[model samples]
Target chain A: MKTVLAFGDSLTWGADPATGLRHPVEHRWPDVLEAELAGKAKVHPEGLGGRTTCYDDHAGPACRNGARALEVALSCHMPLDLVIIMLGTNDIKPVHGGRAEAAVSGMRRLAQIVETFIYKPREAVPKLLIVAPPPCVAGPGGEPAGGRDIEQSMRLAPLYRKLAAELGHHFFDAGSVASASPVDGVHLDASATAAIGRALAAPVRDIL
Target chain B: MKTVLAFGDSLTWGADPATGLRHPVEHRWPDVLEAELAGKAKVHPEGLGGRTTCYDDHAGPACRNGARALEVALSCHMPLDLVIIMLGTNDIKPVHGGRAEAAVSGMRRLAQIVETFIYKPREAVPKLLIVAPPPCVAGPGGEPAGGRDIEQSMRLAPLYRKLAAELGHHFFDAGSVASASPVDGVHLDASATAAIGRALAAPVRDIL
Candidate 1:
């Protein structure tokens, strides 16, 4: 059985508001994908909230930037066949950039950090998929959502696709497929989550 | 044996340069505290760096701003007699607020986060000490001398003292005794780390 590791920020790890009690592990993209994959693939979820694309000056394992995650992913398990990294939204964090160009550059660098760290040493390169998180369609403040800008989401899709092509990794622009959040505005509600989950599975299923 | 679970940020983790190999556990504050205590007490290092005071935002188990750390601290094995919460460096991150007022508010909230979550419900009102980080002086070229912050350190000291007084948590303005890192400008280096270790040990030793 192939193991697909979804390693990125919160979208991969759904927020249940109920901490561990009833955190909707079922609603997260990985679980959604797991259902679609249906025993054919084992999806291991390692979703850290507010994880940055390149470097998280934030702290802990979550403090790692984009390249760090790749190095960590390669080091985490025995052998990871597929690693899907969707990040860079956190980079759009007000302190990091608050501007489109900087955020894009950060994302680009994150892709490079991953490529250099993960693919450089290994002979059998693991399949990688880079998902540019859906745009920050504005939120009621507070993160993983607060830094909202829809255009940046549009910007990331092509950039992600280009980066994926350059790094020999598959790419998915969450914004292109999903609409802005209805309630929270920035985060993906159930519908948006489902959309990406469904579309993401089709390509991954074909590739793996 | 009385356990001194030293909880703080990067300075306690002692994972310098982050080479993953050069995680110089020795120079970290916890190790230093261990040395100072020297069989007098047991020190279990539980430092979660890049965390925030707000339970509503900032990511990570400890970064939860509102009262998240409260639950974490209580749920942790047994009621810790003494919990050392030395943070506020990363609280300046844009996700929260970079301003001093915001920082003090964060500290006030952190005092609450600790009290409401970790100390109040305890069978024995566990002793708590809030250490304000040293100054993070900015160096030449708009680049801060310390990797973290001198300004926040300068600002948060009075803020922490106020919270300590309010919560009745033993407050130590680490800024009074230690020199903030000029290189990173945020965390304590080998020398400063040791000072903090010794400083905290004495106060804790007398009380516990």
Candidate 2:
């Protein structure tokens, strides 16, 4: 009967490289996690394409600020039991002028928001779990090579793990569980996406 | 209730520019047509991104040939009341070496298939409507300018209209009611995407 929020960029959102559409919920990580939990936890996933950790962007039709949207999502899904955040890929875009450390800092900043946020009851504080997304690679295969910045993305996971320990939140390396689609170098293929859901289920269950 | 099969490329697939995902059913034109028709028809939209009229390609994830897919879709949605087709933008992708006339020729071939398709009970010969998609434009503003070929796309409508007449199938000009997103010359904005649905409602209603 408890609820959990899955927050992140396109990988968490389940963007399908073969089709410009989203993978059906069943194929996405959150739903897979939900099924694996066998109805013990309700996973509410909020995934947006081109989302940044805390930076603002103007190119997208919708707002791209993960920080601002997070507060809104928090209130919308009030009395949360936990919030799982997996972000930072879009921060590597040249337009954002972000580096690996900057993205780690962004994730750290979000942790603070989770820790300090106040709900009326006060006992409603949610646990935070940080997930470092699968790394993006050099593209020529299936993905467009335009926004790719391979070196920085490769260095991100270790920083995220260290930050999770410093912030006292749980940490998981998504790349350890799955790799991004070689097709686009950013999004997860259906199989990898499903694997993440299964991989996350046990840890999330322990928290609940 | 009757049934409609909306067949074509990404335009008919309802690719959302903001998300790189499929637009909600309400925002897709065929869904709009269904809503406008109220309870009269059940519309099945079969849109594939990167599809072509008759040309085969090695690049797309699956077969890009529209002609082959059309037969499969027809059989799957047997007893269809109508089949609406809007394609050719990808044909101008430079790989296809397509001129406007060639795309029109492609349309002619599709029309032939639609007409001669052997549906059971003679009464199952579904009506055919050829839609000329809103043309792709030069980008830097709203869309990526790459496979644009604006001059070639502009010359398409008249040719499609002429071909539709020669083929004796119904013809609709999507450009007259909807324009591609100024942000991306290739796809429809939410509003314009919706307008096409509304625009086609009346015509579709009369046919039903």
Candidate 3:
């Protein structure tokens, strides 16, 4: 069977915004992707809450930097067929400067690591698929008054599309099939998360 | 009492080369620094094993980047009067490219974060003390045959000295008072760790 590594943040972790818990394994995108693959591949989901592409978040522990974490993930699950990266929402958070452009740099660094990382002797380097998460929505409290988060979230898809093209990696926009849940404006409900998994099945199959 | 954050890697964590476990609290440098202060200040030690100045180590979990970790340290330990940093040994490891110059850039970025971090309203920014660790020695097995680790370890003190001066921060060469334990060629024994704490008392008092 082929192998896959799903590298991402809380969204890929299957965070349930309604209850602040995780959606069941069957409901998460990576698992859904595996189910859609129908025994042809094993998908490993490696996700952490509050992870950023490359920036640092001072609000919590230091493990949130995606670039640093990606290195660990890449080495841990080696001899893989593909790596699907879905991040950037945390980079748009206020603590990390809330800029879409900065997340672009973070994504670029992550792609570079995948492209240049050394594998075991005779092992093939994994292919990369960059997935842009759906845009965030505003909550009932009418938070982030300036609408900067909304604007920045929307900008990630176009920016990431250009980046993936420039780097010769496959690209998919989760927003094409999913949207952030209104419960918290950043996380996805079960259906939205599963939609991403279902939608990527065809493209992932094509890439593999 | 004034507050101080002892940010670093295994040496500051007081790794006992004899058993590869941590030295008791009293034997660790930060605790010793506190004891030496005679109630004039509280010293908080924030150290992790295998942590680099700013580079990512793919061998383990992702909290190893000192730049990313420092942000959490600065925020968690607010109202810090001083932040004593002792790192770079890990950065010279083969996994991180083992270049002293790269570690220098990492230290520079760390200093910039401490200098420019946003603190609580009316809170004062902490003073920085860059401590260059003692050079690595060859182990009983005569490991690292080319002597690159030893050479790079020695270069840290002089380079960090220059950086501290340029950044207008305090500089301390721990090599003057301590040396790495021969057992591992990297970690410190109890005596060496305590010596650093004892040696820093006077300088720390003056700074505070």
Candidate 4:
């Protein structure tokens, strides 16, 4: 059995921290993923609640910088069969320093980090999977406006897809599988969670 | 061996996504915790980086709401020996819309959430260990200058002690043993990590 790590923000994190309770089973994709992979492997979770693809943040827990993420990853000291990268929206959220290009840059930066760091000898590098997050839902605020960024996020999917193609990796459109946010409709819903779990499982397993 | 699910944030979720590695042995407190228990218990980490106390936010992947944590806590299903909570620093940060009072309120709210949740019947109710986050380095443009929130996090330790006393929860000041943080200076360093693990192991063993 090989090790796999899921890296990204809230949709991957599960539910928001303020809501009373997550919608139970289907709400947290990791649980779903664990269930799906039960007995065959040991799955560990590293969910970052408000994580973005790439950024240096001080307000929120400074995201594990791509370089920092690489440092930790290289330390695993074992071959990783699969590594999933799902993020970018926090860059889209106007709150932090949001930008579409920044999202793209973050993804590329993350890819480079993975390329440079992961151990297990170059011959056994973990296969990568990039899952684009659901488009951003602008809450009453614009820029961070009402569901405006989905259009923006959707427009960017191909960029991610293109990224996967260039890196010789796989890409999954989270928007296509499960787009609506769960709590504020800005993230993944229980249905969305299910979609992500099931959708990613087969691909992740295949890659392994 | 009994199972202990450490439900927390980046402090707990110590691995990097891009590289798929982790902090040093002593740095990743969970590893130290596992060693401290010496196979007496299995510590499973269910932590998200950059999130907070228990509010079920529906936005990201984290099932964070206090209720969700409890639900996840209960989902362990087997008899649990302990549930260690080291939250609040992230909760009180500027991004989350919190004040010291709000932080305290969140602590109180979290206690209530735990009380209402983590159901294992009276005899099996897993012990609760509340570890107040160590004081954080003031945030850039985030921390209210001279606001004493870092002091507040320190102060929350006693408040948490008082609250724990009222709620019958185990409490420990992360700062009592060290002054550094994890990864950065805001979390727990290796020394602090080992201390926390050892400190927690002893108390948890009491009930076990």
- Model 2: per-residue Cα lDDT over A91-169, one tens digit each: 8887877468768878988898888775423567899889888888655654334465777887788999899898888
> Interface RMSD for each candidate model?
7.9, 18.5, 10.1, 10.6
- Scored by CA lDDT, what does every candidate get? 0.63, 0.77, 0.81, 0.60
Model 2 backbone overlap count: 8
DockQ of all candidates, in order? 0.04, 0.02, 0.07, 0.04
lDDT of 4 by residue, B3-32 (tens): 676666655655332232444545566667
Which model, 1 or 4, shows the larger DockQ?
A: 4
**Candidate 1 — what's its lDDT?**
0.63
Order the candidates by lDDT, highest first: 3, 2, 1, 4
RMSD of each: 10.9, 15.7, 12.5, 11.8
Question: What is candidate 1's lDDT per residue for A44-103, written digit by digit as tens?
Answer: 777777676654565544464555564676666525567777776666666554434444
Candidate 1 TM-score to native: 0.53
Regions of model 1 farther than 4 Å from truth: A1-208, B17-23, B55-67, B116-122, B139-141, B145-149
lDDT measured at residue A4 in model 3 versus the true structure, 0 to 100:
92
Error of 1 at B176 (Å): 2.7
Candidate 1 C-alpha lDDT tens digits along B174-207: 7787775545445566777777787777888886
Model 4: which docking level applies?
Answer: incorrect
Off by over 4 Å in 4: A16-26, A61-67, A73-78, A95-98, A118-124, A137-148, B1-42, B45-208
Q: What is the TM-score of chain A alone in each candidate?
A: 0.80, 0.95, 0.95, 0.82
